[PDB]
Amino acid sequence: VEMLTSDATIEEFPEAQVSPFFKNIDLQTAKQVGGAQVGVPILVEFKITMTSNY
Amino acid sequence: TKARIAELEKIIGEVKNINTRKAEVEKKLAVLDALRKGRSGPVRMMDALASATPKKVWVKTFSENNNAVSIDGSAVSHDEVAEFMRGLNGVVWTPKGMGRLVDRRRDSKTARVEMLTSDATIEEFPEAQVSPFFKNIDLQTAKQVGGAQVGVPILVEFKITMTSNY
Amino acid sequence: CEEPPAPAPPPAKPKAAAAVPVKAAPTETGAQAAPSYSYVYNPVGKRDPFRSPI
Amino acid sequence: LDLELADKSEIAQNLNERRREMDVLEQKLSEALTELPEQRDIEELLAQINDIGKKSGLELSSVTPGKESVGGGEFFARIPIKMTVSGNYHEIALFLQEMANMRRIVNVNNIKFDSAKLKNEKVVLQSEFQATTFRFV
Amino acid sequence: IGKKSGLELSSVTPGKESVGGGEFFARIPIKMTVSGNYHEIALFLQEMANM
């Protein structure tokens, strides 16, 4: 779904953390899609990439 | 007059009866929140079935190489991990060597818990010391994992690497 | 004017004094905390692991 | 009569402010708070955080206020402050313990820190501590 | 006493008061970090112990 930024290969430094099991790289993108007169979604489409643990 | 003045002596009698009890609930409970941390303290991160536990608290992974031990653990707060780190050593580490085990950690190819920073090869200068037997290189990382609505751990996940003596 | 105070009464203070007092409270109250402190911590302990693995 | 009517509104308001925080102080098994006195001075909290940071030797790389937690209490809006300081482990333990010994309502909670040097050629720990004070609603 | 002993005072770091280090006293620890010669640090120590 090419609303999305691309990619999946990099090197990561932790800023903040809540799951000890997951290394999210970043919220790669996010765009609030409104819709039209035919219908809504209105919400925030997004994309994330994340390496877990082991 | 004499009616509502009485009303007000009573309402202020309340407000004072009030204000002095707050400063004691206040402090009793600050104590109570130290103590709940004093009962979480002796307890956890990582479930096991052991009669006696060799460490003060439980931890996660332990992997050695007959020169250094790269460990993986968790502690109750900025305190028990400070107690644990003080019990070992403290070091100014400098020229680090990168080696194929680091990338096997980035690869996930050697099983561990990738909250952790990597590495296990460097050169160490002592800052402070408590065990004459152990050269801790540094608290490689530490992150307080909160949990979710399905459950807690709330504690501070951490990682350390340490070469002993002999 | 009003005098050393006013007349007999002294007077008028149904106005001064009535749209004053104040309301006092006076709030003999909201000062400084000792707070309070919690207590630490429960272990006896053991060995297991970690005896065999070191 | 008219001054006493002043005292009645004053003390009724002080009663409301009791209910406000005495009943919050009687709160139960869940989350538990620290004591809440009316601190009501924020900029001095930021300033004193900067000072304890400086005397601990830490570089304060970022202080970021929060949003008030509109559903974090019926009688108090919690404002969280996320602080971001770098230095030695001893110095960040120090910074934390000084903020936990302050005379203001900066309840430090969820802590984190990590090694800020990519290549890891010198010791350095970036630290991000979360600490909040509890304004009224 | 650091300066007259010839030492470079690379860091002085106060502590936290030891809330459970006494019923009648809060102990404040101060960690001092000075560099020089063995004779000079022995000196610095003995002067602080004679203060």
XYZ file of C-alpha atoms in Angstrom:
462
model
C 0.000 0.000 0.000
C 2.127 2.795 -1.386
C 1.033 5.373 1.025
C 3.983 3.822 2.806
C 7.569 4.820 3.052
C 9.882 1.975 2.101
C 12.921 0.247 3.569
C 13.772 -2.389 6.210
C 17.558 -2.261 6.761
C 19.413 0.085 9.135
C 21.181 0.484 12.514
C 19.259 1.491 15.602
C 19.906 3.367 18.829
C 17.315 3.232 21.615
C 15.541 6.413 22.655
C 12.663 4.964 24.715
C 11.372 1.443 25.221
C 8.373 -0.345 26.738
C 8.487 -3.915 25.457
C 11.860 -5.511 26.326
C 11.209 -7.866 23.465
C 10.788 -5.436 20.553
C 13.095 -2.937 18.802
C 10.831 -0.727 16.730
C 12.998 1.255 14.347
C 10.517 4.178 13.982
C 6.986 5.122 12.933
C 8.130 5.150 9.316
C 5.130 7.227 8.257
C 1.618 8.334 9.203
C -1.037 10.182 7.177
C -4.632 10.865 8.207
C -6.779 9.678 5.301
C -10.048 11.597 5.216
C -12.068 9.861 2.515
C -14.701 11.448 0.312
C -18.443 11.879 -0.215
C -18.622 8.164 -1.075
C -17.373 7.304 2.419
C -14.973 7.758 5.334
C -12.089 6.358 6.944
C -10.804 9.638 8.510
C -8.175 7.722 10.470
C -4.373 7.805 10.472
C -2.833 5.364 8.020
C 0.661 4.463 9.194
C 3.720 2.279 8.673
C 6.245 0.810 11.138
C 9.116 -1.699 10.949
C 10.275 -3.648 14.012
C 12.800 -6.351 14.900
C 11.683 -8.471 17.814
C 13.723 -10.587 20.140
C 15.206 -13.672 19.599
C -24.821 37.411 62.624
C -24.460 34.998 65.551
C -25.980 32.225 63.411
C -23.654 32.347 60.406
C -20.558 33.160 62.486
C -21.241 29.864 64.271
C -21.698 28.215 60.872
C -18.244 29.519 59.963
C -16.472 28.517 63.163
C -17.771 25.015 62.437
C -16.836 25.024 58.727
C -13.322 26.255 59.567
C -13.114 23.714 62.386
C -13.607 21.200 59.600
C -11.108 22.868 57.220
C -8.419 22.685 59.911
C -9.287 19.211 61.278
C -8.827 18.482 57.551
C -5.595 20.239 56.709
C -3.578 18.691 59.502
C -4.672 15.115 58.707
C -3.647 15.525 55.054
C 0.026 16.093 55.919
C -0.006 12.754 57.743
C -1.917 10.682 55.190
C 0.509 12.297 52.768
C 3.612 10.982 54.511
C 2.289 7.609 55.712
C 1.587 6.849 52.046
C 4.923 8.087 50.751
C 6.228 5.464 53.195
C 3.742 2.945 51.774
C 5.000 3.501 48.216
C 8.564 3.021 49.399
C 7.430 -0.250 51.011
C 5.564 -1.651 47.999
C 8.872 -1.081 46.235
C 10.412 -2.914 49.207
C 8.228 -5.947 48.434
C 8.613 -5.796 44.669
C 12.342 -5.406 45.335
C 13.031 -8.900 46.659
C 11.091 -10.245 43.663
C 11.552 -11.072 40.096
C 12.016 -10.540 36.540
C 12.066 -14.067 35.211
C 10.073 -17.095 36.225
C 11.898 -20.172 37.461
C 11.540 -23.233 39.663
C 14.413 -23.000 42.139
C 14.670 -23.635 45.872
C 17.576 -21.255 46.494
C 18.568 -18.592 43.957
C 22.291 -17.860 43.508
C 21.772 -14.104 42.927
C 19.990 -11.518 45.071
C 17.210 -11.252 42.471
C 16.481 -13.322 39.401
C 17.861 -12.360 36.008
C 17.411 -13.618 32.469
C 20.322 -15.029 30.450
C 23.917 -15.930 31.353
C 26.528 -16.701 28.688
C 30.239 -17.114 29.392
C 33.501 -17.729 27.540
C 36.000 -18.567 30.338
C 37.317 -14.992 30.233
C 34.161 -12.892 30.465
C 30.474 -13.440 31.150
C 27.929 -11.525 29.098
C 24.774 -11.518 31.208
C 21.208 -10.388 30.578
C 18.938 -9.459 33.418
C 16.415 -7.238 35.123
C 16.126 -5.486 38.493
C 13.478 -3.704 40.512
C 14.492 -0.089 39.867
C 17.315 2.465 39.659
C 18.228 1.076 43.085
C 18.651 -2.705 43.068
C 20.419 -2.462 39.705
C 22.557 0.195 41.403
C 23.152 -2.129 44.357
C 24.047 -4.938 41.948
C 26.291 -2.758 39.763
C 28.044 -1.347 42.830
C 28.679 -4.867 44.133
C 30.836 -5.433 41.038
C 32.824 -2.688 39.357
C 32.713 0.503 37.320
C 34.951 1.254 34.396
C 35.845 3.791 31.705
C 35.817 1.585 28.611
C 37.526 2.759 25.439
C 38.636 1.062 22.154
C 35.960 -1.519 21.399
C 36.457 -4.314 18.892
C 33.577 -5.392 16.670
C 33.230 -9.135 16.153
C 31.005 -11.646 14.403
C 29.062 -12.417 17.589
C 27.659 -8.871 17.711
C 26.161 -9.331 14.250
C 24.894 -12.777 15.205
C 23.013 -10.843 17.886
C 21.748 -8.410 15.269
C 20.941 -11.455 13.114
C 18.991 -13.007 16.040
C 21.140 -16.009 15.079
C 22.403 -16.561 18.668
C 19.276 -16.637 20.828
C 18.907 -13.782 23.296
C 16.772 -10.788 24.257
C 17.267 -7.924 21.850
C 16.358 -5.239 24.220
C 20.076 -5.588 24.800
C 23.005 -3.705 23.468
C 25.591 -6.026 21.963
C 29.331 -6.583 22.239
C 31.852 -8.281 24.558
C 35.338 -7.106 23.514
C 37.084 -3.911 24.673
C 39.724 -2.361 26.985
C 38.818 -1.216 30.466
C 39.953 1.424 32.932
C 38.713 1.260 36.533
C 36.524 4.046 37.871
C 35.182 2.415 41.060
C 35.332 -1.122 42.409
C 33.796 -3.215 45.180
C 34.555 -6.839 44.338
C 38.334 -7.328 43.935
C 37.475 -10.330 41.838
C 35.304 -8.772 39.109
C 35.926 -6.222 36.323
C 32.500 -5.152 35.138
C 32.935 -3.261 31.885
C 29.708 -1.198 32.264
C 25.931 -1.406 32.640
C 25.633 -1.890 28.896
C 21.964 -0.902 28.932
C 18.865 -0.519 31.101
C 15.228 0.130 30.145
C 12.217 0.097 32.478
C 9.661 -2.181 30.825
C 6.151 -1.197 31.874
C 3.957 -3.925 30.419
C 0.354 -3.560 29.326
C -3.260 -4.194 30.320
C -2.559 -7.929 29.988
C 0.055 -7.674 32.748
C 3.067 -6.013 34.371
C 6.619 -6.275 34.815
C 7.281 -2.515 35.375
C 10.894 -3.253 36.294
C 14.216 -2.225 34.736
C 15.461 -4.679 32.136
C 19.235 -4.408 31.877
C 22.423 -5.834 30.395
C 25.986 -6.056 31.761
C 29.232 -7.752 30.682
C 31.954 -8.639 33.194
C 35.343 -10.370 33.253
C 36.166 -11.973 36.593
C 39.381 -12.990 38.044
C 41.221 -15.946 37.894
C -15.908 61.915 56.920
C -15.683 59.034 59.439
C -14.265 59.934 62.896
C -11.677 58.164 65.297
C -14.027 55.770 64.443
C -17.471 56.915 63.300
C -20.259 58.172 65.410
C -21.587 55.871 68.107
C -21.613 52.803 66.022
C -18.821 53.524 64.448
C -20.867 53.795 61.998
C -21.165 52.622 58.442
C -19.017 49.531 58.905
C -21.959 47.369 57.914
C -20.484 48.392 54.554
C -16.722 48.419 55.011
C -16.856 45.453 57.373
C -19.685 43.588 55.650
C -18.106 43.534 52.190
C -14.918 42.754 53.954
C -14.602 40.216 56.448
C -13.011 38.862 54.066
C -13.584 35.937 54.252
C -10.780 35.152 56.609
C -10.929 31.532 56.528
C -8.256 32.536 57.784
C -6.564 29.452 56.368
C -4.079 28.603 59.164
C -3.289 25.687 56.821
C -1.435 24.831 53.680
C 2.234 24.679 54.741
C 5.242 22.293 54.297
C 5.385 18.454 54.214
C 7.741 15.926 55.871
C 6.297 13.778 53.277
C 6.466 10.080 54.395
C 8.749 7.159 53.416
C 8.263 3.490 52.386
C 10.183 0.408 53.650
C 12.526 -2.185 52.001
C 12.618 -5.286 51.257
C 11.844 -9.079 51.489
C 14.437 -11.674 50.652
C 15.956 -14.556 52.260
C 17.740 -16.420 49.476
C 19.037 -19.452 48.115
C 20.868 -21.332 45.513
C 19.984 -23.360 42.505
C 21.033 -22.248 39.576
C 23.062 -20.243 39.887
C 25.348 -22.805 41.710
C 25.751 -25.352 38.863
C 25.988 -22.681 36.056
C 29.014 -20.929 37.786
C -23.006 40.223 58.869
C -21.192 41.158 55.656
C -17.707 40.103 56.783
C -19.058 36.822 58.130
C -20.587 36.186 54.707
C -17.031 36.546 53.397
C -15.744 33.935 55.843
C -18.502 31.509 54.798
C -17.519 31.479 51.119
C -13.815 31.332 51.998
C -14.220 28.300 54.233
C -16.716 26.564 51.921
C -14.096 26.861 49.187
C -11.446 25.498 51.550
C -13.806 22.580 52.289
C -14.209 21.850 48.586
C -10.410 21.906 48.267
C -10.220 19.433 51.126
C -12.633 16.968 49.543
C -10.538 17.481 46.439
C -7.354 16.185 47.951
C -8.153 14.369 51.222
C -10.386 11.916 49.332
C -7.674 11.518 46.690
C -5.231 10.881 49.532
C -7.580 8.144 50.831
C -7.333 6.399 47.446
C -6.959 2.671 47.190
C -5.464 -0.489 45.647
C -4.624 0.395 42.071
C -2.146 2.904 41.046
C -1.087 4.729 44.197
C 0.062 8.359 44.294
C 2.552 10.251 46.370
C 1.198 12.905 48.708
C -0.127 15.965 46.931
C 0.357 19.408 48.451
C -0.561 22.405 46.305
C 2.854 22.952 44.749
C 1.664 25.268 41.956
C 5.114 26.467 40.843
C 6.359 24.758 37.687
C 9.133 26.992 36.333
C 10.987 26.612 39.633
C 10.698 22.847 39.154
C 12.303 23.105 35.711
C 14.978 25.436 37.091
C 15.833 23.175 40.031
C 15.961 20.158 37.714
C 18.512 22.108 35.670
C 20.488 22.927 38.832
C 20.635 19.395 40.214
C 21.618 18.325 36.710
C 24.474 20.827 36.601
C 25.848 20.005 40.049
C 25.695 16.306 39.158
C 27.871 17.025 36.100
C 25.278 15.993 33.512
C 24.651 17.655 30.164
C 20.911 18.380 30.018
C 20.317 17.595 26.353
C 16.533 18.104 26.494
C 13.745 18.886 28.948
C 10.289 18.398 27.462
C 7.070 19.171 29.384
C 4.008 17.024 28.917
C 0.311 17.267 28.558
C -1.874 17.384 31.625
C -3.582 14.024 32.205
C -7.229 15.091 31.990
C -8.287 11.547 32.928
C -5.437 10.961 35.364
C -7.458 12.072 38.369
C -10.753 13.654 39.360
C -9.058 16.204 41.627
C -5.713 16.761 39.869
C -4.270 17.215 36.381
C -0.910 15.468 36.279
C 1.699 17.263 34.176
C 4.540 14.889 33.190
C 8.019 16.189 32.392
C 10.438 14.032 30.401
C 14.080 14.884 31.124
C 17.032 13.877 28.950
C 20.520 14.132 30.481
C 23.828 12.459 29.601
C 26.853 11.444 31.632
C 28.171 8.695 33.891
C 26.154 5.986 35.648
C 27.202 7.374 39.040
C 26.125 10.853 37.945
C 22.686 9.793 36.676
C 22.014 7.736 39.799
C 23.027 10.972 41.551
C 20.717 13.193 39.495
C 17.817 10.801 40.153
C 18.413 10.591 43.905
C 18.640 14.391 44.165
C 15.343 14.849 42.321
C 13.870 12.206 44.649
C 15.162 14.236 47.613
C 13.726 17.565 46.415
C 11.168 19.679 48.281
C 8.751 19.670 45.325
C 6.342 17.205 43.759
C 8.551 15.662 41.071
C 7.674 11.968 41.315
C 10.188 10.197 39.077
C 8.887 6.933 37.653
C 9.783 5.154 34.417
C 13.543 5.418 33.792
C 15.774 4.451 30.898
C 19.353 4.978 29.713
C 21.770 3.589 27.144
C 25.242 4.102 25.686
C 25.128 7.147 23.392
C 28.275 6.344 21.363
C 27.617 4.373 18.158
C 31.085 2.857 17.786
C 31.445 2.713 21.597
C 34.878 4.335 21.871
C 34.305 6.160 25.182
C 31.969 5.666 28.123
C 28.830 7.817 27.957
C 25.225 7.151 28.983
C 22.295 9.086 27.603
C 19.504 8.921 30.174
C 15.799 9.689 29.837
C 13.863 9.916 33.104
C 10.135 10.601 33.367
C 8.999 12.669 36.345
C 5.647 14.344 36.955
C 3.935 16.852 39.253
C 0.230 17.016 40.044
C -1.508 20.381 39.461
C -5.186 20.760 40.383
C -7.965 20.147 37.860
C 43.213 21.388 50.419
C 43.162 19.861 46.943
C 44.850 22.908 45.427
C 47.550 23.224 48.084
C 48.257 19.501 47.720
C 48.849 20.046 43.992
C 45.968 17.867 42.796
C 43.698 18.553 39.838
C 40.132 18.284 41.141
C 38.546 16.592 38.141
C 35.105 16.164 39.754
C 33.283 16.745 43.033
C 29.869 15.107 43.134
C 27.478 15.454 46.110
C 25.292 12.568 47.145
C 21.835 11.808 48.288
C 20.971 12.046 51.946
C 20.729 8.577 53.514
C 17.106 8.629 54.695
C 17.623 5.231 56.332
C 21.184 5.913 57.453
C 20.130 7.117 60.885
C 17.091 8.004 62.962
C 18.593 11.326 64.073
C 20.733 12.298 61.061
C 20.616 12.326 57.262
C 24.080 11.485 55.987
C 25.063 13.373 52.830
C 27.955 11.623 51.024
C 30.322 13.532 48.760
C 32.414 11.663 46.189
C 35.613 13.527 45.284
C 37.748 12.839 42.209
C 41.284 14.273 42.167
C 44.404 13.324 40.194
C 48.111 13.556 40.918
C 50.937 11.781 42.716
C 50.638 9.104 45.414
C 52.340 11.413 47.926
C 49.911 14.198 47.003
C 46.763 12.059 47.366
C 47.931 10.634 50.681
C 48.434 14.320 51.531
C 44.973 15.401 50.367
C 43.407 12.570 52.383
C 45.337 13.336 55.574
C 44.439 17.032 55.331
C 40.734 16.251 54.938
C 41.099 13.896 57.923
C 42.657 16.774 59.888
C 39.922 19.301 59.036
